[PDB]
Amino acid sequence: AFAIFLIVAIGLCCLMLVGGWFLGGRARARLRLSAKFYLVAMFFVIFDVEALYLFAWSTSIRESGWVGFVEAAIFIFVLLAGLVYLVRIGALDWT
Amino acid sequence: MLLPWLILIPFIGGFLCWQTERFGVKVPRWIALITMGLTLALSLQLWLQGGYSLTQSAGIPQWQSEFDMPWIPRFGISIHLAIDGLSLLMVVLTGLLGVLAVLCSWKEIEKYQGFFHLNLMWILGGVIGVFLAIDMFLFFFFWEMMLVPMYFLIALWGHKASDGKTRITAATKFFIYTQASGLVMLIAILALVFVHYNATGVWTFNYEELLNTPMSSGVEYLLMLGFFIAFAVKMPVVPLHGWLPDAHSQAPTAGSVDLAGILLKTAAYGLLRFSLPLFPNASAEFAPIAMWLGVIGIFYGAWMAFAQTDIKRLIAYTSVSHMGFVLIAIYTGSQLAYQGAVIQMIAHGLSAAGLFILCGQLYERIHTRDMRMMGGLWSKMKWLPALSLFFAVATLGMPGTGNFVGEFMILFGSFQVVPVITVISTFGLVFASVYSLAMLHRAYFGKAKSQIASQELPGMSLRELFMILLLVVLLVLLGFYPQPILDTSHSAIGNIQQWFVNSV
Amino acid sequence: MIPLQHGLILAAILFVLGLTGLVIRRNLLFMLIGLEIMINASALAFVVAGSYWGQTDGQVMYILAISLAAAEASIGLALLLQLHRRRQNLNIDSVSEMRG
Amino acid sequence: MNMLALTIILPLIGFVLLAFSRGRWSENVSAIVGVGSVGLAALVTAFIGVDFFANGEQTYSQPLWTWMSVGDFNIGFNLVLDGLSLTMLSVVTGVGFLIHMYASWYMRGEEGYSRFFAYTNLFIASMVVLVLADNLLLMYLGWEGVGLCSYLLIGFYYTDPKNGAAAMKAFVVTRVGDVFLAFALFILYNELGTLNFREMVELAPAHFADGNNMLMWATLMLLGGAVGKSAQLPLQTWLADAMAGPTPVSALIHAATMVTAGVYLIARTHGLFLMTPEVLHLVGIVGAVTLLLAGFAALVQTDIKRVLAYSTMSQIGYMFLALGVQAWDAAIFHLMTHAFFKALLFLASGSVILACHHEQNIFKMGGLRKSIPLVYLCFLVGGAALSALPLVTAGFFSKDEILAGAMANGHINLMVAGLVGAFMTSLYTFRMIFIVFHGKEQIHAHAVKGVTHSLPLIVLLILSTFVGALIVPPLQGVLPQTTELAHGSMLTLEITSGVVAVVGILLAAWLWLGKRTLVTSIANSAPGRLLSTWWYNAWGFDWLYDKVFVKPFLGIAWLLKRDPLNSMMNIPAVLSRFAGKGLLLSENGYLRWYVASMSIGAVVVLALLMVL
Amino acid sequence: MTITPQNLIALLPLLIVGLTVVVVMLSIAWRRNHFLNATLSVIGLNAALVSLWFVGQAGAMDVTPLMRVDGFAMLYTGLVLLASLATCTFAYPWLEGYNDNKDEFYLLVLIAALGGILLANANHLASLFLGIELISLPLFGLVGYAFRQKRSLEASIKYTILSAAASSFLLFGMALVYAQSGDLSFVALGKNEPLLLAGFGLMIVGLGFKLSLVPFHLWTPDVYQGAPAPVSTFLATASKIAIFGVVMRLFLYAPVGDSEAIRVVLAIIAFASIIFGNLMALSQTNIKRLLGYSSISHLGYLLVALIALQTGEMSMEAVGVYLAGYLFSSLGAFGVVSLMSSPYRGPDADSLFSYRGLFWHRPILAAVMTVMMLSLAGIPMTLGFIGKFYVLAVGVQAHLWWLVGAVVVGSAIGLYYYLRVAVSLYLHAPEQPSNWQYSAGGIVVLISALLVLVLGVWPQPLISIVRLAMPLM
Amino acid sequence: MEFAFYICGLIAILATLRVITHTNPVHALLYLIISLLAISGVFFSLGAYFAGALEIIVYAGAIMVLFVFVVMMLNLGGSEIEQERQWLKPQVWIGPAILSAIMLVVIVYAILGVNDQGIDGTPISAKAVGITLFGPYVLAVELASMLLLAGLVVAFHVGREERAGEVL
Ligand SMILES: OC[C@H]1O[C@H](O[C@H]2[C@H](O)[C@@H](O)[C@H](OCCCCCCCC3CCCCC3)O[C@@H]2CO)[C@H](O)[C@@H](O)[C@@H]1O
């Protein structure tokens, strides 16, 4: 019933961890590579957190109202402007 | 009505000096002068228009003239200026000493003349204010506003010492001292306006209305201490004096003329008008200590003065010695003691002014302050030896000069109220003999010299002569026919006197 | 059951541990670690309080606390990297140039 | 009359003129104005004295203005010419004028001629103020002015250290005296609030219903001052060294001016001292002791000037005895005669110490009799009047009238003493005289005659004789009480005086005029040597004073050359500088530190919050 | 509780700022032009100010449970905007020297400023936490903005770590108090409970760190020196002014704000910051470090007027007056220092020596620097005084003797060092600008001193105007 | 639902102590993760579901992650091991240990004062935490974005290292 969600959770985390670690291993092999790699990984964590927020918004949408939605809007728009920033800063050129 | 222009003319004066220097490297002096002639003239005009002798005792709040204008209404603080016989005299004195301080530096250049003279005007004017001011805020404000400019004058135009203290350090000692004493007098004033309002629900920083204030015995005390301390540092009273010898040692000549001849005066005058009226009872209880510190200043002053190797410093300690006598004179109800105080303050004003101006030309001619390398100096110069002699005579209370007039009235009164102390102080007079003499010998009598510097020296320019002679004449007349002074001051004196006593 | 005192005691114990570590550690990595342990302990406390009282506030705050956590790990590690090109070990005492 | 002012305005004008003319004037012109003014002041003294006698001896008061006004305190600039005043004044402008001529010649070609004469004019002006004293304050202008001018003339030859320090011993001491006088003034004003002789004399018996306790002090201080300016004990120490001045000065200040000022003040306040018996008694006493010690010491001086000095001290002593025993007319009479023959003595001493090429020491002098007639003769006349030779000397009449008061009031101890003192004086006076004019002529002197030297010496010689005794001071119209007269004992007394005087002169003749082998033998003796140095040294007073005052005073001055108070105050500044550095020691860039710091501080905040 | 058009008008400056933030960050991402990005940011702030005016036309409402928008908020916002704006007009030339990208700067500035407005407008507890995170994060970067020097970097790291430790205490404190007392709003401080106090004291720890109050002051000189001079300007004025705004308002509503234990720990803290401040300030040669210790003390002085809040309402007023004074004075000094660093070159004008004569070739900066140099020390003719004044007034009037004495003693010590400095500026010169970007900073300092002089001499205008912006009670 | 709390807690505690003691970073980060999970469990104990879950997927899910990533890319962890062991000794550890122990004691003492009023572990739907998150706290949601974004801008301006190697 419950413990299965907790298993998919500890699992999800476990996997993000191992994966991130291996990506660290492969990363170990005008900015420079390591800088770009970091910036990217970081924006990943950010997207993660802000996503948390988004879901929170999702669970209750009609109860939030036109202001709730307008909020979600400015929120996501800014997140996106943040991505435009990261890209246009050149952490994309290599990974 | 006219008080404003009395503070302005010096202010605007300074500004003009500064913005005229660039027209000719000689002009600033002339500006300072002219403006000082104007100011003095005005002082003499308010002197003439108001009654030479005015009603003796109509009550504490009385003035030949008054001027009121809003300033910080939020606080009931306004521009309040008020003339008395007392203040009138202090203002004439300051105007004169002004003209002279402009003369005595007529032959001293460093940095910029514009900046020098301006600084000077801000000092002089600001203090004039310290006299005319009756609204406690404005008073305190003028009180600090002058200290700044003075400290620029010392730290920017004064010569380095023999003891290895940079002029900047003298300026420092002076400033910290007077300024923070200032802090204490401020917090007193604060406590007082607070009490008056907290018993009549009205914020006012006004002298008159603050008198009314009812006060728990013990609080009036503490307040009056604040005011004292701040007057004790600028007088000076003992412990709080060292800034004086140092600051005189390092000061430019105009700075020592104005410092010795006025600011200390303001210290006493504030003692009178504020420490007594505002707090008659606490004062009355504090008179003993006040008078004893007065005797200790008489003596300790004369001793340090006499054991002096440097001229300017001995002179300074002389002023300390005499202030001792004034501080005593004040806390002794006598109105005689107060007439004595007044005439003697203005007297010693003229006197010390004379000594520091001369000592100035003496330095100008043998580039030294250490008597240790000067002697039999009489043979060399023309007038300096003998005018220096006259002023040395007058310093120690010699009849024929004001200093006697005032110091002896003071003594008479003091004696009527407390003899033991008066006699002791008179012995102080005997010490005055010693130091004034020692100084005189060391300078002009004995071995032709103790250093090559003594050969036939240059003459005394007409400036120097006629200013030192003007001063002499003044001191002679004051010794001879004091009535005009005694009268001009008798009104205000009688008033403070009556009030101090009655209120106990 | 749920004695508020015990939950809060946990929060405290942890906070303290994290701080201790933060002082003991010379290696900037370890210090950052400390900081994380701390912000975490404080958010924990906040949620525990949000549990004593039937309020969503303990939680939404916790949310903010971890938002912070993230931002600080971002900038803090970014600094560490900027300092790996300047010190093999990230021995922190080495940055003592400015003094009284 | 009514020109009482000119007797000050003249000396004063002269003074200002000579003081504003520094060396720019030929000795003859500055001499002209210097002597001249005072001359015209003498002239005016004559005119006014004559209008005074003619007018019938009426007290003349000329008010000039009011020197100052306060409530109960009114002091005025008024001149009060009466008989006593006329004596003082006449003496001053006369003897003054004479000393002015003799000085005129004596100072030819010397450092600051114009200067010396200016100072002198101021000395006269000052004295004349002193004597026309309406109150005590204007008088105090007198006393101070005097003391000052005396400081300047004594310390006239500034180049030498010893000279100056003599001028300063003078000023300091005369000053301390002037302080006692002050106290007198303060008390007399707190009590009578008038400080004007007559009035004080009236409101004095009135207000002092239960007096004899505050009046005492007032008078006794008046004394303090008197003693001070008259060099009586114990403010005498300043007189000997005073001789460091040019001779004409040692005449002026030493015979007709300062000491006389002390006695005269004690005279004008006669009524006040009267009301206080004991202190008048004191006056007498100190007068006595002083004439005695002064004599004994005068006996040993190896210096012309200094002998004459302790002489003036002993003589003033006499005068103070005369006053101390209500013999006021006697005291003042004697003051006059003494101005005469002391002026004589000192001028002569100048002509001699000069004619010996500045020698000034009796022993390095000798046999002057043949070399100089005028001078020798002068020392004989003078020295004799001073010795109080029975006839041909006014000094005899002086001493006499005095002892006539003394004995005439049952004060036979002061009388006997005073006699012992006449013996003394004749003795030392002639030891000196003989030693200087008789015996082996060591320094070959020669003589020079001029009007400006001879004339003065001549008039002083005349008036120094019995012819001087011809003049009598109008001390009756003033009201000073007449002395209790005596008779039949007046002659026993008189001849006792004459006899002691003559025995004196003779014994001096036998003591020195020969080999002096007796005196010499008795000098080398142990006791004779001890005493010798004793009396030579002002009795040891200069020692007692320099040891209990000067030494410890200078002791303090050295002990505080730097303000222990200024330092005591620099304490906080220091505490705050070192506090500065101390604390500042916690900014050490150690991040770890700062953190541990937050930790601890938190801990303190929590502990405090818990305890409160 | 939602949001109406009213509440938007009343969130106006905040909006305008946010907008400028995003806009500028985007423009940066597209073109990378210095001049443009700057002029943009300034257009934006100015906007937010006049916006203030339009807030003035509207009511003193409450936008969420997290805010309140009154005249008090209007005052603190106005200030923080001035601070920021100035900071920018200063950092321009200094950056113009800088070799790297100059743009990210003005962004970090905008962000911090926004956070400062959250502080001047907060009423909830979270709002505060977030306001301090916004006032901290971009500042870390601003400290490290020239990381090339060992200083700037060591600085940025120290400031960052410690700053995080503090944010951490502050958090865990909020946790403890809300835990004991089930509300986040200020007014409901859990209506002298142990845990309540405790939490409040950790909160102290944090606020105190941000405020430079002893014993949480240490980082101050390191960080004032290490960072680019303008970033110091903003580091003393904006951040501190605003965090103080929030601490005043908090300790006001907060009923536990009338507590004794806390008033005591507080007073202690204040006293000690005054003293240690000026004492450590004396023996300094490094202008910056001086200004830093100096700040520790001045935070002492305001802390006074905060301790005397309970007794009298002029208290706050004083605080406002003195906060404006402090403002223009610190902008003057720091203004002439970063302006002295001028184009980037290498390290800044840390050494006082550099200042000497300096009036002989660069007169007006020396004037400005002396007028401010007096102001800061408490001399008449300067707002610094007037503020001194009020602090003392509120001091005795509230009967806080120790604290007052300390105030005067301090003032003395300061007399010493500040006086020295100005004189330095007049001593003799040691032996050895074209762009209208320098003139901005120039007329900026100029104006600012002209304010401490005029407003020094005729305070009414400011006083009443501050008296006018009360909080809702 | 009760004991689970306690065991989760002590387990976590032990885990953090361990992270603080150990020298090899990976072991540390791992341990801190274990701790965080135990605290996710504790969170669950109090029916803070959105909390505990959020901790699993976000805190130890992406943060602790970015950490591991950086320690692994830098690969710094490993070498300096003995150099790290030198630092942790009794002499250096005891001071701070005592201090923080004290502080802990004062805090805890101040904890045992407030009234516990033990409250049941009654679940809190995420949807609720969101109903509040996006109603009362609207502005906060909007600003946490700003906090993270600034986090970025600075993280870039610092964490980025130009090409200083190439020489002109
Ligand atoms: O012109 C001569 C000299 O004058 C000065 O020297 C000397 C000068 O000679 C000398 O008179 C002067 O006075 C030293 C006075 C000590 C006693 C004071 C009074 C003590 C009394 C105790 C009972 C209470 C009343 C007071 O000092 C100068 C050297 O410190 C000059 O320095 C020399 O160059 C000159 O040659």
PDB file of C-alpha atoms in Angstrom, chain B residues 165 173 177 238-243 245-246 300 303-304 306-308 317 335-336 339 376 378-379 382 386 389 393 396-400 404-405 408-409 411-412 415-416 422-424 426-427 429-431 433-434 437-438 440-441 444-447 469 479-483 486-487, chain D residues 20 22 24 65-74 77 115 119 126 137 140-141 144-146 148 151-152 155 158-161 164-165 167-168 171-172 175-176 178-180 182-183 185-187 189-190 195 214 552-554 556-558 560-566 568-570:
ATOM      1  CA  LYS B 165      54.404  67.066  19.676  1.00  0.00           C
ATOM      2  CA  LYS B 173      43.920  67.301  22.697  1.00  0.00           C
ATOM      3  CA  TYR B 177      38.665  67.986  25.498  1.00  0.00           C
ATOM      4  CA  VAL B 238      42.232  72.148  37.478  1.00  0.00           C
ATOM      5  CA  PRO B 239      42.589  68.579  36.378  1.00  0.00           C
ATOM      6  CA  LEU B 240      41.173  69.723  32.983  1.00  0.00           C
ATOM      7  CA  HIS B 241      43.805  72.241  31.814  1.00  0.00           C
ATOM      8  CA  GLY B 242      46.707  70.583  29.941  1.00  0.00           C
ATOM      9  CA  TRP B 243      45.112  71.116  26.573  1.00  0.00           C
ATOM     10  CA  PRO B 245      49.511  74.827  27.654  1.00  0.00           C
ATOM     11  CA  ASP B 246      49.875  72.414  24.735  1.00  0.00           C
ATOM     12  CA  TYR B 300      49.391  75.081  40.683  1.00  0.00           C
ATOM     13  CA  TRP B 303      54.104  77.097  39.850  1.00  0.00           C
ATOM     14  CA  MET B 304      53.846  75.348  36.483  1.00  0.00           C
ATOM     15  CA  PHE B 306      57.280  79.682  36.625  1.00  0.00           C
ATOM     16  CA  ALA B 307      58.953  76.314  36.108  1.00  0.00           C
ATOM     17  CA  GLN B 308      58.471  76.959  32.383  1.00  0.00           C
ATOM     18  CA  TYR B 317      49.747  78.855  32.827  1.00  0.00           C
ATOM     19  CA  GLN B 335      28.123  91.628  43.607  1.00  0.00           C
ATOM     20  CA  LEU B 336      31.444  93.317  44.238  1.00  0.00           C
ATOM     21  CA  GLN B 339      32.076  93.459  39.143  1.00  0.00           C
ATOM     22  CA  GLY B 376      69.972  90.570  28.102  1.00  0.00           C
ATOM     23  CA  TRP B 378      66.958  94.498  26.104  1.00  0.00           C
ATOM     24  CA  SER B 379      70.079  95.874  24.387  1.00  0.00           C
ATOM     25  CA  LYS B 382      63.817  98.889  20.673  1.00  0.00           C
ATOM     26  CA  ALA B 386      59.962  97.446  27.631  1.00  0.00           C
ATOM     27  CA  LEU B 389      58.027  94.699  30.698  1.00  0.00           C
ATOM     28  CA  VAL B 393      54.042  94.416  35.347  1.00  0.00           C
ATOM     29  CA  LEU B 396      50.852  90.564  38.450  1.00  0.00           C
ATOM     30  CA  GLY B 397      48.215  92.781  40.042  1.00  0.00           C
ATOM     31  CA  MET B 398      49.835  96.191  39.784  1.00  0.00           C
ATOM     32  CA  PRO B 399      47.725  99.305  40.416  1.00  0.00           C
ATOM     33  CA  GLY B 400      47.673 101.644  37.429  1.00  0.00           C
ATOM     34  CA  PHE B 404      44.593  95.215  39.931  1.00  0.00           C
ATOM     35  CA  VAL B 405      41.212  96.931  39.781  1.00  0.00           C
ATOM     36  CA  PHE B 408      41.258  93.463  44.167  1.00  0.00           C
ATOM     37  CA  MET B 409      37.517  94.086  43.914  1.00  0.00           C
ATOM     38  CA  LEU B 411      39.340  89.938  46.636  1.00  0.00           C
ATOM     39  CA  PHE B 412      37.381  92.484  48.681  1.00  0.00           C
ATOM     40  CA  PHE B 415      36.784  88.263  51.688  1.00  0.00           C
ATOM     41  CA  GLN B 416      33.418  89.594  52.828  1.00  0.00           C
ATOM     42  CA  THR B 422      40.720  85.182  50.036  1.00  0.00           C
ATOM     43  CA  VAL B 423      43.909  85.599  52.018  1.00  0.00           C
ATOM     44  CA  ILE B 424      45.293  82.350  50.608  1.00  0.00           C
ATOM     45  CA  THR B 426      46.285  86.840  47.784  1.00  0.00           C
ATOM     46  CA  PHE B 427      49.376  84.797  48.539  1.00  0.00           C
ATOM     47  CA  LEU B 429      49.225  87.154  44.153  1.00  0.00           C
ATOM     48  CA  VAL B 430      52.676  86.911  45.735  1.00  0.00           C
ATOM     49  CA  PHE B 431      53.500  83.938  43.464  1.00  0.00           C
ATOM     50  CA  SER B 433      55.117  88.397  41.401  1.00  0.00           C
ATOM     51  CA  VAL B 434      57.673  85.520  41.106  1.00  0.00           C
ATOM     52  CA  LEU B 437      59.317  88.527  37.073  1.00  0.00           C
ATOM     53  CA  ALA B 438      61.261  85.340  36.284  1.00  0.00           C
ATOM     54  CA  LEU B 440      60.858  89.160  32.481  1.00  0.00           C
ATOM     55  CA  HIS B 441      64.450  88.457  33.569  1.00  0.00           C
ATOM     56  CA  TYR B 444      65.494  90.677  28.785  1.00  0.00           C
ATOM     57  CA  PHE B 445      67.918  90.824  31.717  1.00  0.00           C
ATOM     58  CA  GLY B 446      71.293  89.219  32.336  1.00  0.00           C
ATOM     59  CA  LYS B 447      73.932  87.625  30.125  1.00  0.00           C
ATOM     60  CA  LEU B 469      50.354 100.752  22.424  1.00  0.00           C
ATOM     61  CA  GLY B 479      43.252 100.839  35.675  1.00  0.00           C
ATOM     62  CA  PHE B 480      42.558 104.563  36.083  1.00  0.00           C
ATOM     63  CA  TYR B 481      38.867 105.247  35.342  1.00  0.00           C
ATOM     64  CA  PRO B 482      36.888 101.956  35.401  1.00  0.00           C
ATOM     65  CA  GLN B 483      33.464 103.570  35.884  1.00  0.00           C
ATOM     66  CA  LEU B 486      31.506  98.955  36.083  1.00  0.00           C
ATOM     67  CA  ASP B 487      28.342 100.752  34.927  1.00  0.00           C
TER      68      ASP B 487
ATOM     69  CA  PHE D  20      59.689 107.724  25.360  1.00  0.00           C
ATOM     70  CA  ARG D  22      65.542 106.365  24.651  1.00  0.00           C
ATOM     71  CA  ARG D  24      68.012 109.904  21.529  1.00  0.00           C
ATOM     72  CA  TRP D  65      37.287 112.296  40.829  1.00  0.00           C
ATOM     73  CA  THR D  66      36.054 108.916  42.045  1.00  0.00           C
ATOM     74  CA  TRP D  67      38.485 106.078  41.289  1.00  0.00           C
ATOM     75  CA  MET D  68      35.616 103.605  41.334  1.00  0.00           C
ATOM     76  CA  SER D  69      32.106 102.888  42.566  1.00  0.00           C
ATOM     77  CA  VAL D  70      30.253  99.769  43.641  1.00  0.00           C
ATOM     78  CA  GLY D  71      27.301  99.538  46.012  1.00  0.00           C
ATOM     79  CA  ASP D  72      28.723  99.940  49.497  1.00  0.00           C
ATOM     80  CA  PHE D  73      32.251 100.282  48.076  1.00  0.00           C
ATOM     81  CA  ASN D  74      33.209 103.855  47.152  1.00  0.00           C
ATOM     82  CA  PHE D  77      40.908 109.891  43.819  1.00  0.00           C
ATOM     83  CA  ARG D 115      66.193 105.470  31.521  1.00  0.00           C
ATOM     84  CA  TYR D 119      62.436 105.651  36.555  1.00  0.00           C
ATOM     85  CA  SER D 126      54.614 107.384  43.132  1.00  0.00           C
ATOM     86  CA  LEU D 137      43.522 102.361  48.039  1.00  0.00           C
ATOM     87  CA  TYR D 140      48.127 101.440  47.711  1.00  0.00           C
ATOM     88  CA  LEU D 141      48.643 102.802  44.223  1.00  0.00           C
ATOM     89  CA  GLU D 144      52.884  99.524  44.788  1.00  0.00           C
ATOM     90  CA  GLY D 145      54.168 102.243  42.452  1.00  0.00           C
ATOM     91  CA  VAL D 146      56.987 102.796  44.904  1.00  0.00           C
ATOM     92  CA  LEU D 148      57.941  98.807  41.557  1.00  0.00           C
ATOM     93  CA  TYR D 151      62.667  97.111  41.880  1.00  0.00           C
ATOM     94  CA  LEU D 152      63.579  98.839  38.615  1.00  0.00           C
ATOM     95  CA  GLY D 155      67.832  96.062  39.331  1.00  0.00           C
ATOM     96  CA  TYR D 158      70.741  94.328  34.652  1.00  0.00           C
ATOM     97  CA  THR D 159      73.801  92.783  32.932  1.00  0.00           C
ATOM     98  CA  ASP D 160      74.924  91.275  36.260  1.00  0.00           C
ATOM     99  CA  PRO D 161      72.908  88.321  37.762  1.00  0.00           C
ATOM    100  CA  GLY D 164      68.988  91.575  39.358  1.00  0.00           C
ATOM    101  CA  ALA D 165      68.458  88.937  42.035  1.00  0.00           C
ATOM    102  CA  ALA D 167      66.042  93.629  42.725  1.00  0.00           C
ATOM    103  CA  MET D 168      63.927  90.486  42.952  1.00  0.00           C
ATOM    104  CA  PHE D 171      60.211  93.055  44.996  1.00  0.00           C
ATOM    105  CA  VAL D 172      59.228  89.691  46.487  1.00  0.00           C
ATOM    106  CA  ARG D 175      55.276  92.371  48.030  1.00  0.00           C
ATOM    107  CA  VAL D 176      54.612  89.924  50.891  1.00  0.00           C
ATOM    108  CA  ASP D 178      52.001  94.532  50.585  1.00  0.00           C
ATOM    109  CA  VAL D 179      49.864  91.402  51.079  1.00  0.00           C
ATOM    110  CA  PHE D 180      49.693  91.927  54.818  1.00  0.00           C
ATOM    111  CA  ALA D 182      46.056  94.158  51.761  1.00  0.00           C
ATOM    112  CA  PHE D 183      44.499  92.068  54.538  1.00  0.00           C
ATOM    113  CA  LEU D 185      42.436  96.918  53.852  1.00  0.00           C
ATOM    114  CA  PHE D 186      39.972  94.019  53.407  1.00  0.00           C
ATOM    115  CA  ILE D 187      39.250  93.883  57.144  1.00  0.00           C
ATOM    116  CA  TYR D 189      36.429  97.696  54.673  1.00  0.00           C
ATOM    117  CA  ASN D 190      34.351  94.724  55.799  1.00  0.00           C
ATOM    118  CA  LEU D 195      38.716 103.040  53.853  1.00  0.00           C
ATOM    119  CA  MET D 214      38.802  92.709  64.514  1.00  0.00           C
ATOM    120  CA  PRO D 552      61.099  74.238  49.374  1.00  0.00           C
ATOM    121  CA  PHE D 553      59.221  76.567  46.968  1.00  0.00           C
ATOM    122  CA  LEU D 554      61.743  75.884  44.213  1.00  0.00           C
ATOM    123  CA  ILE D 556      57.880  72.112  44.497  1.00  0.00           C
ATOM    124  CA  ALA D 557      58.576  73.871  41.197  1.00  0.00           C
ATOM    125  CA  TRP D 558      61.136  71.194  40.254  1.00  0.00           C
ATOM    126  CA  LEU D 560      56.134  69.418  39.228  1.00  0.00           C
ATOM    127  CA  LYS D 561      58.034  70.617  36.125  1.00  0.00           C
ATOM    128  CA  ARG D 562      55.512  68.479  34.226  1.00  0.00           C
ATOM    129  CA  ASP D 563      51.804  68.508  35.152  1.00  0.00           C
ATOM    130  CA  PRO D 564      51.192  65.392  37.257  1.00  0.00           C
ATOM    131  CA  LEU D 565      47.571  66.353  36.646  1.00  0.00           C
ATOM    132  CA  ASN D 566      47.895  66.448  32.859  1.00  0.00           C
ATOM    133  CA  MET D 568      46.795  61.724  35.695  1.00  0.00           C
ATOM    134  CA  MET D 569      44.347  62.742  32.944  1.00  0.00           C
ATOM    135  CA  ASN D 570      46.255  61.134  30.070  1.00  0.00           C
TER     136      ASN D 570
END
